[PDB]
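Bench log, entry 3. Co-assembly request; chain sequences pasted below exactly as received.
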Amino acid sequence: LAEALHTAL
Ligand SMILES: [Co+2]
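Structure output for the full assembly:
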C-alpha cells in the first residue's frame, strides 16, 4: 500500500 500510493503521487 504505502509504496503503491507514494509512486502514484
Ligand atoms: Co515511499
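The chain is about 80% helix and 0% strand. Residues 2-3, 6 surround cobalt (II) ion (CB under 6 Å).
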